[PDB]
Amino acid sequence: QSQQRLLLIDSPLHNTFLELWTMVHFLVPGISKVVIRLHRVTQPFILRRTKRDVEKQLTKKYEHVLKCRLSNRQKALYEDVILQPGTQEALKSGHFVNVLSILVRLQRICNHPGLVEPRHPGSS
């Protein structure tokens, strides 16, 4: 028992008019170029909008890419890695994808020498 009804939907399907007709019927029980006419028929009961409204609508996102050079240890490790038998692997010698991924991972962890090269105390 209700005098009014309100429905929320993310987005409906274009084709498969069965669902649209069923929804329109269940909105109110008083009903028994293609896309253009379909939209024209759904004019009296429709209210849709796009995300173009977000422009200047308090939606303020900021991203700043900061460039940072490498340290002497990082330079040394990079030169060592690139200057290794892996050169032939980097030149597509065998298992290209695997060796490329391995080299990418190595260079990735090389962003800090403490990871690949753990500095340890010089006990006596």
Q: Which residues form the interface with other proteins (CB under 8 A)?
A: 58, 60-70, 74, 78, 90-92, 95-97, 100, 103-104, 107-108, 111
Provide, rounded to whole angstroms, the least separation between the CB of residue 60 and other proteins.
5
What is the spatial distance between Cα 26 and Cα 30, in angstroms, rounded to a whole number? 9
Closer CB to other proteins, 25 or 92, in the complex: 92
Provide, rounded to whole angstroms, the least separation between the CB of residue 119 and other proteins.
19
Are the CB atoms for 25 and 31 separated by under 8 Å?
A: yes
User: CB neighbours of 100 closer than 8 A, spacing ≥ 6?
Assistant: 89, 90
Closer CB to other proteins, 22 or 71, in the complex: 71
